Write an enzyme that holds these catalytic residues in place. Structure first.
Site, PDB file in Angstrom:
ATOM      1  N   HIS A  41       3.477   3.030  -9.200  1.00  0.00           N
ATOM      2  CA  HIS A  41       3.361   4.143  -8.260  1.00  0.00           C
ATOM      3  C   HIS A  41       2.882   3.717  -6.859  1.00  0.00           C
ATOM      4  O   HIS A  41       2.826   4.570  -5.979  1.00  0.00           O
ATOM      5  CB  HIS A  41       2.531   5.318  -8.811  1.00  0.00           C
ATOM      6  CG  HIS A  41       1.051   5.077  -8.928  1.00  0.00           C
ATOM      7  ND1 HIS A  41       0.214   5.146  -7.822  1.00  0.00           N
ATOM      8  CD2 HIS A  41       0.291   4.890 -10.032  1.00  0.00           C
ATOM      9  CE1 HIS A  41      -1.016   4.948  -8.282  1.00  0.00           C
ATOM     10  NE2 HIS A  41      -1.019   4.776  -9.604  1.00  0.00           N
ATOM     11  N   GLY A 136      -8.216   5.155  -4.830  1.00  0.00           N
ATOM     12  CA  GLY A 136      -8.186   3.728  -4.522  1.00  0.00           C
ATOM     13  C   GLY A 136      -8.522   2.839  -5.711  1.00  0.00           C
ATOM     14  O   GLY A 136      -8.434   1.615  -5.616  1.00  0.00           O
ATOM     15  N   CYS A 138      -6.829   2.803  -8.599  1.00  0.00           N
ATOM     16  CA  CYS A 138      -5.633   2.432  -9.371  1.00  0.00           C
ATOM     17  C   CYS A 138      -5.410   0.930  -9.335  1.00  0.00           C
ATOM     18  O   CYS A 138      -5.666   0.293  -8.308  1.00  0.00           O
ATOM     19  CB  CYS A 138      -4.403   3.197  -8.891  1.00  0.00           C
ATOM     20  SG  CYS A 138      -4.599   4.999  -8.934  1.00  0.00           S
TER      21      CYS A 138
END
Ligand SMILES: O=C(Nc1cncc2ccc(F)cc12)[C@@H]1CCOc2cc(F)c(Cl)cc21
Ligand SMILES: O=C(Nc1cncc2ccc(F)cc12)[C@@H]1CCOc2cc(F)c(Cl)cc21
Ligand SMILES: [Cl-]
EC number: 3.4.19.12
Lengths: 298, 302
Positions: A41, A136, A138
């Site tokens: 993503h 942030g 991820c």
């Protein structure tokens, strides 16, 4: 003495954290050998179509104050693999392992490729993790250490509306029925990890907490009828076998401890605590209890 | 979202852990630049521990009596000195993994990460708090002495604790990195007991603000309290007095949530009176006191 929620030393993993920037999105990547792994993503859906539009120079990878050059890119399930020119000199001995619900692991929470904290958690039976993540985070990874081998088991992808977290193994396969897309997704009804509660009751006995012990024992079938009622996971013969060493060490058979657990579920703690907790703790596996009550090092 | 007991990443500290042996005793040492820091009781036998004269025991030792092992490499001790209850072993090699560091002495209620070690090898990391009675509720076995407590704000490691001993109640006592014990403890096997422990009030309030930030409001009430009335009540539950300093420190969290410090004090008073009534706050059935106001802001904002 003492019993703490203890994470594995995070050093071998810290040397792998990098920042991955694609367009306006910035998240974390795991740099092992000449590949950087991160959630797909980051390119945001038709991920094949979105990815085909990207070139190597669109992905900015930063390892500390050093920009790594991307020389290739491919997708494996929900993980993006960025081939880089430089192999990580800090690459530890590692494996990619997929874990089962109830298994625990350490999470090295990162922001901008920089580790900020380490915590322990369990893969819930509903495949979510009760983590602590902000925007942030991820790309942050979950891991265990077996001797000198880091077993990567989790990569953070998203937060569900209830504040719980969802992610994948390092091969990009999600834990649970989740997808990496902005849509209505909800975690299923969660249950308590029974074998882990029993392991934690053994840790309490090892630490001198015995008030919950009783003279009674139960059958595996009767305990599972009680466990089904209180949203507890069924306890298998495998779980009983796994608790064997702790049972031998304390002199409390697994079904003897199950009768303690059954009374605790029907009667509560009655103002008492176990290892400083008024709730039955389920995020320590039998192995975590033996590791901590015996001092294994890495 | 979420709130976890979170430790600092331990990597910068792992690269400093070494094994220190002196005679039959083996514990951990902290290797920073060309010095290895470790508890001075490494020079003692279990027999000497009742009334050791460390100066007398240390004068009898030579550099080659201290075996220092960093991984599979034996370091050479070229000097030794004592600073309070810590032994400083000068070695012939500066640690290439030495991070940016400071030695800081902390106050009760302050939290820190503990990197538990055995034989100079890290086995686990957990988050701790210096209790009001100056003990820490750690998780330590035989051979854990020399394990360190630290914070990593910015890229700098602030060493604040070195583990020395376990008290009879299972709690732990240690020193700052200058060898000064926290609390009225001595590195002797004499009868020593921790004073009655109390709850870190400012930390519980910070954790109640963390719960509000995370959407938990069930425990709030329409009441306020004077700081004096709160302290009269809280003292009866073995809670530490809340000072004006604590009120000031909670200011940012109060401004962020819109709940005055003294209003949050009134929710705490009510929680002490009623209990949780089958409910939890941030997944806990007890009032959590090992998150400082600084820990709450760091974890909830960055
Ligand atoms: O989950 C996400 N963000 C965050 C993750 N973990 C804690 C977060 C905490 C707060 C926060 F605002 C964002 C956090 C991103 C951005 C929001 O939407 C999606 C949708 C998706 F399908 C996927 Cl795979 C990822 C995201
Ligand atoms: O405290 C000690 N050991 C241990 C420390 N932390 C957890 C331990 C857990 C168990 C255990 F058996 C030893 C553990 C040593 C050895 C026993 O006596 C003393 C007396 C002292 F004066 C000093 Cl400064 C140190 C020690
Ligand atoms: Cl302090």
């Amino acid at each position: 003495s003492g019993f703490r929620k203890m994470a594995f030393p995070s050093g071998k993993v810290e040397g792998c954290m990098v920042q991955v920037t694609c367009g306006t999105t910035t998240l974390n990547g795991l740099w092992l050998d000449d590949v950087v792994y991160c959630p797909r993503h980051v390119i945001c859906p038709n991920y094949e179509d979105l990815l085909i539009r990207k070139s190597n120079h669109n992905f900015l990878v930063q390892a500390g104050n050093v920009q790594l050059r991307v020389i290739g890119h491919s997708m494996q399930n929900c993980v993006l693999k960025l081939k880089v020119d430089t192999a990580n000199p800090k690459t530890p001995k590692y494996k990619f392992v997929r874990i089962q619900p109830g298994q625990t692991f350490s999470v090295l929470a990162c922001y901008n490729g920089s580790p900020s904290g380490v915590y322990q958690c369990a893969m819930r039976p509903n495949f979510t993790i009760k983590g602590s993540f902000l925007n942030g985070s991820c790309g942050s990874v979950g891991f265990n250490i077996d001797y000198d081998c880091v077993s990567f088991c989790y990569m953070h992808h998203m937060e569900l509306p209830t504040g719980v977290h969802a992610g994948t193994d390092l091969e990009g396969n999600f834990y649970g029925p989740f997808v990496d897309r902005q849509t209505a997704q909800a975690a299923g009804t969660d249950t308590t990890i029974t074998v882990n509660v029993l392991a934690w009751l053994y840790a309490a006995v090892i630490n001198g907490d015995r008030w919950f012990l009783n003279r009674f024992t139960t059958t595996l079938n009767d305990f599972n009828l009680v466990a089904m009622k209180y949203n507890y996971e069924p306890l298998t013969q495998d779980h009983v076998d796994i608790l064997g060493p702790l049972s031998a060490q304390t002199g409390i058979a697994v079904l003897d401890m199950c009768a303690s657990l059954k009374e605790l579920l029907q009667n509560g703690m009655n103002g008492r605590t176990i290892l400083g907790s008024a709730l039955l703790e389920d995020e320590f596996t039998p192995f975590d209890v033996v590791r901590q009550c015996s001092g294994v090092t890495f």
